[PDB]
Amino acid sequence: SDEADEAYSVTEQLTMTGINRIRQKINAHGIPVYLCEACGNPIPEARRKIFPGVTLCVECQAYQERQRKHYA
């Protein structure tokens, strides 16, 4: 083949297995939890409506993601 013909497939695998992990972080299951598993705050109805099966309030999720951002 050629440079561009394999470069296409390298970029394509890159993009696909980059979409898939960002899409797997998305919650698709259903189990309402009503109580943030770190702080016990009641996860409001709407923030449970967007992502069904979310088991953290928005505050604790922001905290945990801020912690993730440095690889701790």
Binding site: E3, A4, A7, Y8
Partner: protein, 149 residues
């Protein structure tokens, strides 16, 4: 070895030698100048409150990431007012939609992202990126003919 969202208008994103040293021999874009220091800068139309003036303004790389720069293909109503409300711009790396009264600069002309080599291609916007890369590199080897056409 790779392109950064501040290569815009400074270094050609497509024109490089494919092969051993990709992205090390990046070639300069069309309107790119060098700063008084040695830094690369590119022009932008100064766009005050809503009107896109025809006074141009050379922004460097360190400064362009603090302005809402317009989009070269943004329409204008015979006076310099964008005929959309929101308007495609690129504030800090990530491009976006910004309202009418937020743009700080516009682009000088739409060929200002590509080098002289990759500006002689017609319909560059209908090509794979790497295809235009190979295309510029192979245009750069053309042998003169008997009757140039």
């Amino acid at each position: 070895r790779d392109v950064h969202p501040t290569h815009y208008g400074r270094v050609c994103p497509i024109e490089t030698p494919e092969g051993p040293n990709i992205g090390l021999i990046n070639s300069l874009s069309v309107y790119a100048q060098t700063n008084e220091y040695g830094f690369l800068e590119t022009p932008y139309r100064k766009v005050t409150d809503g009107v896109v003036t025809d006074e141009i303004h050379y922004l460097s790389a360190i400064e362009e990431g603090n302005y809402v720069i317009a989009q070269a293909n943004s329409n204008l109503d015979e006076e310099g007012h964008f005929v959309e409300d929101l308007v495609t711009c690129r504030s800090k790396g990530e491009s976006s939609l910004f309202s009418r009264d937020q743009v700080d600069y516009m682009d000088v002309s739409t060929q200002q992202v590509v080098s002289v080599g990759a500006s002689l291609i017609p319909f560059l916007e209908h090509d794979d990126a790497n295809r235009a890369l190979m295309g510029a590199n192979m245009q750069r080897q053309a042998v003169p003919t008997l009757r140039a056409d």
